[PDB]
């Protein structure tokens, strides 16, 4: 007695970070990089 769910992501490979899709996983894995990094911890003072 409830709406049944179905379908995870027909797409080949999507970026759970932004949502970009890449036919080839390799393209995605490498892309995800654009996200990681550039995460400083406040001021440096050095």
Contact footprint for Zn ion (CB under 5 A): 15, 17-18, 20
Cα separation, 4 vs 26, in Å, equals 33
Which is closer to Zn ion, CB of 36 or CB of 45? 36
Cα separation, 46 vs 44, in Å, equals 5
Nearest approach, Cβ of residue 30 and Zn ion (Å): 10
Nearest approach, Cβ of residue 20 and Zn ion (Å): 5
Nearest approach, Cβ of residue 44 and Zn ion (Å): 28
* Strand residues in the chain grouped as ranges (E): none
- Per DSSP, 23 falls in state S
């Amino acid at each position: 007695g409830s709406s049944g769910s179905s379908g995870t992501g027909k797409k080949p490979y999507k970026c759970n970070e932004c949502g970009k899709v890449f036919t080839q996983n390799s393209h995605l894995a490498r892309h995800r990089g654009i996200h990681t990094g550039e995460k400083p911890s406040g001021p440096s003072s050095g």
